[PDB]
Structure formats: structure tokens, C-alpha cells
Amino acid sequence: VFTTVDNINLHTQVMTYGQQFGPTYLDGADVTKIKPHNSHEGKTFYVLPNDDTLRVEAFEYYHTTDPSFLGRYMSALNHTKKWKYPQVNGLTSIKWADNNCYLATALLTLQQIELKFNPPALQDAYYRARAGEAANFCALILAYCNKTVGELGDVRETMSYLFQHANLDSCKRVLNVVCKTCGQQQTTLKGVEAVMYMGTLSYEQFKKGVQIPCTCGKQATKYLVQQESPFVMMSAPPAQYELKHGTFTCASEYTGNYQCGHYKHITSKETLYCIDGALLTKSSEYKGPITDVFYKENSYTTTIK
Ligand SMILES: C=CC(=O)Nc1ccc(C)c(C(=O)N[C@H](C)c2cccc3ccccc23)c1
Ligand SMILES: [Cl-]
Ligand SMILES: [Cl-]
Ligand SMILES: [Cl-]
Ligand SMILES: [Cl-]
Ligand SMILES: [Zn+2]
Ligand SMILES: [Zn+2]
Ligand SMILES: [Zn+2]
Ligand SMILES: [Zn+2]
């Protein structure tokens, strides 16, 4: 048979699996204690890294040394394999199961923004997800986010974790802070901090300025001087918000109470589409509880001296 950690580098091997190889998985399902059948023969098994060659191969494919990672990934995959991934409005969604609404919203969002994942495991799975086969990609999202199946998930926290595994180095955000007393200070943010803001949904309002505390004691004004990124994510606690066709890429709708409510996805095409897992409605106007709005960007410089 063949052992692997990445399903690229295959090593030939020939008493339980757990005694010979340590924790040994097949197609999601733990076969550590279980024995070697005759149709459990010739195929490819995943193993926990137990020698240097496999640790290096594991880090090179996943970008983590965390020894739980593989087990958390296989426990997720055992469920995500059984979910349905229908095409909805030319996007791979997920049918509702095991509290996955937040994952579906993230997955739909990731198909509409420009992102390169550093870990080969994630990039490969992203491409396969975009082409309709998203089980692997969803298991990896759960593992990288330290979330298990059924656990209550936040889209902003999931996007934040995923962004930290993505090539956002070229992304730059210059902010000016204007206080009556302390005066003007400019800050350069890079990477994840350049593409994410919590406090308002409106990219327009971020450019025009928002009111934040100053250390001195007063209320100051933060405004956007310069943005170099393919997109920005604007987030705020759920609040009734109007979404206008053509002024945003997509948005997370969040209904109900902290943690135990539900997400739906709004996307701006030729009209506004609402994706609720397998279900698709459309309308020209939208007002509802929004918590995330994604916008297109390349290069922005303010006309405020
Ligand atoms: C840190 C621990 C944690 O478990 N976080 C987490 C996990 C899972 C979920 C669904 C949420 C969450 O309900 N997020 C929504 C969008 C939300 C965000 C911020 C402020 C809010 C105010 C009122 C209602 C919703 C609010 C947060
Ligand atoms: Cl890394
Ligand atoms: Cl299941
Ligand atoms: Cl759900
Ligand atoms: Cl990474
Ligand atoms: Zn990395
Ligand atoms: Zn399940
Ligand atoms: Zn849900
Ligand atoms: Zn001040």
C-alpha cells in the first residue's frame, strides 16, 4: 500500500495499521485500531507524520507543524464529504447541515474576491471547490480555524483566519487620525489589517471619516488616505442596512441572537441575489441585517489634504 501526508508524495509500505504506522486514516474514517483487509490493499492511506521526511512534507503542504491538525482535518472531512454542494447562480454553495451556514457564506464570498493561499493544501482545495468539489476545502477551513463540525461560526473570524494564510503582503492601508488637541497622526497597516475594518459597513463612510476614541480622552476622526488591495471587507455588529445593486461585491446577512443565529449571502450581479444554502431569491432592492460587505479595490488615494 501507499502512505502519504499530502496525497502528492506516496511512500510504498506493507498487526493493525496503528501498531505499524501510528494513527492511519482512509478517505476520512480513522482505521488506527482496525486491521488490513484485502480491498484495503494497493490504495493510499494518510498517516500522522512519524519521521522527518513526513514532518517536512506535512509543513510544505499545510504550513503547520500542529500534530492535531491532521486529525482535526480528517474529523471535519468525515462530515463535509456528506454535505451537498449545489451550483447556485454560478457559485458553489452548501446545503444547510451541522450549523454550516457561516461556511457556505465564507465559501460563496471566497469565489468572488481575489486571494492566493500560501499553503499548497488550501490553494489546491480552493481551485477544486470553485469547480464544484468543495468537501476538502470546507474540512481544511474548519481545521485552520480551530473549529469542529456543528460549532457556531462567525464569517468575519473565518475570513480573518483564512486571510492570515493568504498572500496579502502587497496590501497597504494608510489612515490619518485627526484630533482637536493631539493633532494628525498617519499609520501604515499591511496584510490582513489593511483589508479588514470593524465598526462600519460603508467603504464610502470610511473614506469620508468615522468617529473613534483618542487616547487623550476626546473623539477623533479616522479616514482612509490610501488603499492598495484587490478588495476590502467592512464589518459591523448586525444592523438594518440598504444594499444597492452595483455599489458592493457581496455581503453576509446575519439573523437572530449572538452565536446561535443564521447567515445568508447577498451578491450583486445584474440584480441582487440572496443565497440561503441551496435556495436562491432575487430582488432589485435589499434592506436587512448586514454584518459584512465586500468591495472591489485596486489603488485608492483620497482628495483630502
Ligand atoms: C468570540 C467568540 C465567538 O464565539 N464569536 C462568534 C461566534 C459565532 C457567531 C455566530 C458570532 C456572531 O454571532 N457574530 C455576529 C455576526 C455578531 C458579531 C458581532 C457582534 C454581534 C452583536 C449581536 C449579534 C451578532 C453579532 C460570534
Ligand atoms: Cl507558515
Ligand atoms: Cl455526517
Ligand atoms: Cl445551519
Ligand atoms: Cl500560511
Ligand atoms: Zn504559511
Ligand atoms: Zn455531520
Ligand atoms: Zn446556521
Ligand atoms: Zn488627542
Numbering used by the authors: 7 to 20, 25 to 315
The publication says:
There are two distinctive cysteine proteases encoded by the SARS-CoV-2 genome that are essential to the virus proliferation cycle: papain-like protease (PLpro, a domain within Nsp3, EC 3.4.22.46) and chymotrypsin-like main protease (3CLpro or Mpro, corresponding to Nsp5, EC 3.4.22.69). Nevertheless, PLpro is a multifunctional protein having an essential role in processing of viral polyproteins, maturation, and assembly of the RTC, and it also may act on the host cell proteins by disrupting host viral response machinery to facilitate viral proliferation and replication. Briefly, the protein has two distinct domains: the small N-terminal ubiquitin-like (Ubl) domain and the “thumb–palm–fingers” catalytic domain. The palm subdomain is comprised of six β-strands with the catalytic residues Cys111, His272, and Asp286 located at the interface between the thumb and palm subdomains.
